[PDB]
């Protein structure tokens, strides 16, 4: 791919965070951790799982990121819709407004609903995501594997602002500890 160009520097908006969840001083790595992380509740806070958005919103134009996900047994990432729900239940699916895949169990799914198998050879340490809002896509990238295509949501109905989406996952294994990091330009 060349997407490269359309990078764009996201950094976390903690307002948003689970409450476990401890965001680095420059807002560009979450990891999960041992306690509730002293944070007053509010209505924007994800109360089920270990997710996040980034602060920024797009509603235009082709935007690009990195994370790296090195060491880490299960995660979520992509887009969501702003408006996504944050408290209770709920399935990762374009229906709920998110476009995303995850490692879970050695696998790697795309959040269809249902759910897609992806076939990866080379488990990534770094994940590309590209979004072109006016096109209707979401596409992810191996950068371990030259970039390589994993998934491509097409399409797409956004209905809404996007904003990056992560989920550290739970850690009852004491494998998964690692932070996401959002890579550098
Ligand atoms: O709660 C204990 C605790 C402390 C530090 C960390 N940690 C911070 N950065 C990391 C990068 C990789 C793996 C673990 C990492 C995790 C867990």
């Given at each position: 791919h060349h997407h490269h160009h359309h990078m764009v520097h996201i950094t976390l908006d903690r307002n948003t965070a689970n409450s476990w969840l401890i965001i680095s001083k420059d807002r560009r790595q979450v990891r999960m951790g041992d306690?509730?992380?002293?944070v007053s509740d509010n209505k924007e806070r994800f109360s089920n799982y270990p997710m996040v958005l980034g602060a920024q919103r797009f509603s235009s134009g082709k935007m690009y990121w990195e994370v790296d996900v090195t060491q880490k047994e299960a995660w979520d990432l992509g887009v969501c819709r702003?408006?996504?729900?944050?408290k209770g239940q709920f399935s990762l699916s374009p229906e709920n407004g998110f476009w995303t895949i995850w490692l879970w169990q050695d696998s790697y799914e795309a959040g269809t609903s249902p759910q897609t198998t992806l076939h990866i050879q080379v488990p990534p340490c770094q994940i590309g995501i590209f979004v072109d809002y006016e096109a209707g896509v979401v596409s992810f990238y191996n950068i371990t594997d030259?970039?390589?295509?994993?998934?491509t949501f097409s399409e797409c109905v956004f209905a809404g602002p996007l904003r990056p989406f992560f989920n550290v996952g739970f850690n009852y294994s004491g494998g998964n500890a690692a932070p996401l990091k959002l890579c550098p330009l």
């Open positions: 306690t509730h992380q002293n702003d408006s996504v729900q944050r030259h970039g390589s295509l994993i998934y």
